[PDB]
Amino acid sequence: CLGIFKACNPSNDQCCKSSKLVCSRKTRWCKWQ
């Protein structure tokens, strides 16, 4: 997986899906839900 506090794009989100993380469109980073 991709760690915590890692930059990304919502269009090509690649966060650690297992830990309920998604690259937000406003934040451009994986938020912990």
Partner: protein, 229 residues
């Protein structure tokens, strides 16, 4: 304690403190650049601007605590500043902050601490700070009225339509709607008269008692200006 007190003097310098407030009002105008016709490429500089604004605020508070251990912490205003910038940092910590980050917009209320310089506003702010506790008491009593009335309502009209009175949360919201005199007739009570022809005798005394209580709130707001002058 040499550079301690020296840089602490630079903290208490009005150039620095007013510079922080200029950074605050510039941050609020930065959020006033929340248009929809902003571009996606220009959105990234908005993101790094929010980043560096929050960094400036975090730097401000880490200096304010590098001076003060508990002395600022007795002051609730400093606790308000610290609390809201740490909530901004929890927004900067993977949390589902909806928009609670720009609760730091409320830091602009420190400009309120300069707007009292108009001579009527002195009396106005002393008046508001004076009438806080009595208003808290009348909020308590009016919420008690709402509590018993909404319990009666959600037992009464729960069945034929629960969109307005199914739970206690939505029945309580519905009685706040009927409190403020908006579409109780056309939107609410006339559908009840379509089914229950004896609920106007419920709703009309409710309008009288809470119009009474709200006007009583206005009176206990009135009393301060004759109390001071």
């Amino acid at each position: 304690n040499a550079m301690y007190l020296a840089i602490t003097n630079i903290v208490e310098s009005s150039f620095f403190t007013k510079f922080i407030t200029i950074c605050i009002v510039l941050n609020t105008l930065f959020m006033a650049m929340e248009h929809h016709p902003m571009t996606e490429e220009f959105k990234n500089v908005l993101a790094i601007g929010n980043l560096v604004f929050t960094g400036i605020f975090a730097a401000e508070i880490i200096l304010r605590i590098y001076v003060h251990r508990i002395s600022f912490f007795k002051d609730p205003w400093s606790l308000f500043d610290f609390f809201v910038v740490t909530l901004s940092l929890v927004e900067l910590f993977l949390a589902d902050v909806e928009g609670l980050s720009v609760l730091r917009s409320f830091r602009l209320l420190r400009l309120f601490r300069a707007v009292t310089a108009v001579p009527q506003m002195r009396k106005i702010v002393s008046a508001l700070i004076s009438v806080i506790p009595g208003m808290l008491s009348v909020i308590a009593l009016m919420t008690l009225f709402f509590y018993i009335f909404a319990i009666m309502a959600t037992q009464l009209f729960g069945e034929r339509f629960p969109e307005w009175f199914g739970t206690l949360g939505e029945s309580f919201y519905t009685l706040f709607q009927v409190m403020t005199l908006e579409s109780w007739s056309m939107g609410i009570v006339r559908p009840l008269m379509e089914v229950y022809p004896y609920a106007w005798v419920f709703f009309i005394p409710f309008i009288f008692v809470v119009t009474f209580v709200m006007i009583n709130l206005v009176v206990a707001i009135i009393v301060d200006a004759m109390a001071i002058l």
